[PDB]
Design a protein around this nucleic acid. Structure first.
Ligand SMILES: [Mg+2]
Ligand SMILES: [Mg+2]
Ligand SMILES: [Mg+2]
Ligand SMILES: [Mg+2]
Ligand SMILES: [Mg+2]
Ligand SMILES: [Mg+2]
Ligand SMILES: [Mg+2]
Ligand SMILES: [Mg+2]
Ligand SMILES: [Mg+2]
Ligand SMILES: [Mg+2]
Ligand SMILES: [Mg+2]
Ligand SMILES: [Mg+2]
Ligand SMILES: [Mg+2]
Ligand SMILES: [Mg+2]
Ligand SMILES: [Mg+2]
Ligand SMILES: [Mg+2]
Ligand SMILES: [Mg+2]
Ligand SMILES: [Mg+2]
Ligand SMILES: [Mg+2]
Ligand SMILES: [Mg+2]
Ligand SMILES: [Mg+2]
Ligand SMILES: [Mg+2]
Ligand SMILES: [Mg+2]
Ligand SMILES: [Mg+2]
Ligand SMILES: [Mg+2]
Ligand SMILES: [Mg+2]
Ligand SMILES: [Mg+2]
Ligand SMILES: [Mg+2]
Ligand SMILES: [Mg+2]
Ligand SMILES: [Mg+2]
Ligand SMILES: [Mg+2]
Ligand SMILES: [Mg+2]
Ligand SMILES: [Mg+2]
Ligand SMILES: [Mg+2]
Ligand SMILES: [Mg+2]
Ligand SMILES: [Mg+2]
Ligand SMILES: [Mg+2]
Ligand SMILES: [Zn+2]
Lengths: 89, 50, 122, 60
RNA sequence: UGAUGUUAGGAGGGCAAAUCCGCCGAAUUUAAGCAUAUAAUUAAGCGGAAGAAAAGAAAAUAACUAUGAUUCC
RNA sequence: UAAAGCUAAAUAUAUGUAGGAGACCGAUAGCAAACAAGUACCGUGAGGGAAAGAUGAAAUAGUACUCAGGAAUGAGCAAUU
RNA sequence: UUUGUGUUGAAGCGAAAUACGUGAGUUUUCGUGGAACAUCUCCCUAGUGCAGAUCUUGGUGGAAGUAGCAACUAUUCAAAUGAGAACUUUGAAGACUGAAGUGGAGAAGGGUUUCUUGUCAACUGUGAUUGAACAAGAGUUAGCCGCUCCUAAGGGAUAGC
RNA sequence: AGCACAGUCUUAACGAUGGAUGUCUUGGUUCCUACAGCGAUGAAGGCCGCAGCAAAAUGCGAUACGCAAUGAAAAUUGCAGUGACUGAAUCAUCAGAAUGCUGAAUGUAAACUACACCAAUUCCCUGGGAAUAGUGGUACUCCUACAGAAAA
């Protein structure tokens, strides 16, 4: 008709399928299934597959801040006793 | 919309804040080269994607 | 290096180390040669140049002129002498930057810190 | 401007009193900056560092 | 003997994978066509560890004048 | 001499981190990325994914002054090198 | 490996030569350029020689000052501002929408486009002093309006299997 | 003061447009050597904040482009400021202290800064004196003790 399968029916196209996702922040949380299409939030695991090398490296260990792990290096060659302190003066 | 949630409105405020130009005195520094912010957004042209 | 394999002789690596040196290491790089008279009084051959020392210019367009160092700029790798000046196109006056390795120093300003250095350097 | 070594001999009560007066001074400076009186906008840095030092001594 | 207990003291859960352990499991392709065969005890899928893992002290070879736990070249 | 159990070395390492090196590439090449690069941007979504290096020894030399012009800009007997 | 050129100007590039060679090519002059360049004495080595592949990436033409800048009835006189007004503002005319309105108020979607002041490099497919463009500051006040509570078509879980 | 027809095509000299060529390189690539996991004592990842004037990247966490301590050791800057005649201005090291909301996420929920139950909680002097609706605990499975109750 007048809202045919091209320009006409694109005008009816409000509404949302996805929104922001808790646990990964992407606009990939199906609001009606209640499940993330990227990280799979409601379940305990992470949802990554071996047929996508490119995707697998956009969200790996070294792509973030590494808040706690980065302070844990170079202890292996200082090897101080916990609670110690350098000599005063 | 006029009806909003708390988090979404905070995100809108944050995205409005980041749409400002570089400070002028920062240009008078040495060791600096940044003339203008390469990430600038206009409301009618690029959608936030929310 | 020449005979120890645990340090590099690569142009890339140590040309990178020169231009990103931490500010503490830059003062050892900015060192000048001692005059003959100061080389008998002290056993040392060269020292890091400090503010209130006195110098003689040995290379460049301003060779032969003497004066006192008034400022040190560790980020540009240059020093400034008291009566070696310049005119900008405005007419405002500035200093000409001299590289410390183009200079021999003829008089020190000693204090507690340099004493303990000149003692060990003997 | 305070130094940590001059604080180690104080008691807890007066350490807290010093923290309180530092906080009052910082609040006054912020209030003054809120109005267009930028005469003393450079003093905030020192007061912030002093607060940090006092809290460090108290917590240790 | 099951159950109950916000009783005291403790453990498991998620991330990461180049090398390692266990399961599950194709077709493209080659045969100048194609069905067994090949691709391959492979790719994709699901679980479990370490600075290595797995294997390992004969219900083993030989047929000699006899050798002698496992691994690798 | 089966149907129970433990055990180091010689072996491997397209991951992470640190060090050294080559008859290797030289900005359409070499990793997608020599630069605020898995960034800008596109897709409802799973995903897709660039372009972009070089003044001079020194700008602690980045263009002062005059004339014309609303300005932009142009010219000079004027000016840094 | 041998033995050579360069701030008294290298490589590169433009125009050339009473020059050499059957030829691919060597060699030299003048100009620009401002820091590196050869080896033919003999050997080694390879991502080693382009006119085409509706080849790949980038740049540029004739067509050409050409096709075109036609829905929505319609404009005119005077004044202000300004470097500059057919399309900024004021007054006077002639007209339209005609309550099933380019009138009022909400939802989905957008996210500061809202307001006041300033202002024109680019944009506003003609002009532009206008603007939803650009810049600097502001603006959203609830016991009674809503969510929040109930249950629906339905979704996710527990025990067991 | 005077004299070349116009267009089209060809060749020189000087320019416009464009970014090849040569020179450069704090970047890639491959090989060799050494070492090796993190997490309920809350990880990897995500969000939100922090500077006198402060968008991105980098760094940090209500002590927030940095505190304390140790080694050097006068400057650091656009302006304003801050520093010695060496726990101070800056660089490095990094063992003490501190480390927002989340996330396996674990009181119940989640396009909510929504809603429970239990214990009121935290300081200062040396038993007093104060402050605060603020703090902590509560998932499931399993092991060793323990506790009482029940059947037999
Ligand atoms: Mg269709
Ligand atoms: Mg739907
Ligand atoms: Mg909405
Ligand atoms: Mg639109
Ligand atoms: Mg066949
Ligand atoms: Mg065939
Ligand atoms: Mg066939
Ligand atoms: Mg596999
Ligand atoms: Mg596991
Ligand atoms: Mg073993
Ligand atoms: Mg056995
Ligand atoms: Mg075993
Ligand atoms: Mg290399
Ligand atoms: Mg490239
Ligand atoms: Mg050559
Ligand atoms: Mg040169
Ligand atoms: Mg080729
Ligand atoms: Mg060609
Ligand atoms: Mg026409
Ligand atoms: Mg118009
Ligand atoms: Mg009508
Ligand atoms: Mg009418
Ligand atoms: Mg009608
Ligand atoms: Mg408006
Ligand atoms: Mg306006
Ligand atoms: Mg126009
Ligand atoms: Mg705007
Ligand atoms: Mg009501
Ligand atoms: Mg129901
Ligand atoms: Mg003619
Ligand atoms: Mg492990
Ligand atoms: Mg956070
Ligand atoms: Mg001390
Ligand atoms: Mg110190
Ligand atoms: Mg919870
Ligand atoms: Mg709800
Ligand atoms: Mg379970
Ligand atoms: Zn997600």
């Amino acid at each position: 008709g007048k809202a045919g399968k091209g320009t006409g029916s694109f005008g009816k196209r409000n509404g949302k399928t996805h929104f922001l996702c808790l646990r990964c922040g992407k606009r990939s949380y199906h609001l009606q299934k209640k499940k993330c299409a990227s990280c799979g939030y409601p379940s305990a695991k992470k949802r990554r597959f071996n047929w996508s090398v490119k995707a697998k490296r956009r969200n790996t260990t070294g792509t973030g801040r590494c808040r706690y792990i980065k302070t844990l290096r170079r202890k292996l060659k200082n090897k101080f006793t916990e609670g110690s302190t350098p000599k005063p003066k | 919309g006029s009806i909003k949630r708390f988090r979404l409105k905070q995100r809108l405020g944050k995205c409005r804040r980041q749409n400002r130009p570089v400070p002028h005195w920062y240009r008078l520094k040495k060791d600096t080269k940044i003339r203008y912010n390469t990430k600038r957004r206009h409301w009618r042209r690029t959608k936030l994607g929310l | 290096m020449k005979f120890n394999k645990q340090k590099s002789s690569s142009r890339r690596k140590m040309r990178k180390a020169h231009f990103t040196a931490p500010a503490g290491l830059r003062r050892k790089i900015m060192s000048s040669k001692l005059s003959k008279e100061l080389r008998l009084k002290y056993k040392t051959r060269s020292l890091p140049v400090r503010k209130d020392d006195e110098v003689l210019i040995c290379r460049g367009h301003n060779h032969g002129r003497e004066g006192k160092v008034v400022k040190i700029n560790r980020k540009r790798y240059k020093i400034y002498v008291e009566r070696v000046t310049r005119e900008k196109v405005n007419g405002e006056s500035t200093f000409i930057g001299i590289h410390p390795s183009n200079v021999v120093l003829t008089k020190l300003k000693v204090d507690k810190n340099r004493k303990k250095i000149l003692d060990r350097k003997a | 401007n305070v130094k940590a070594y001059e604080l180690r001999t104080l008691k807890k009560k007066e350490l807290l009193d010093k923290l309180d007066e530092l906080k009052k001074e910082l609040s006054g400076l912020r209030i003054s900056k809120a109005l267009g009186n930028s005469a003393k906008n450079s003093k905030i840095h020192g007061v912030r560092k002093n607060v940090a030092r006092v809290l460090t001594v108290y917590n240790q």
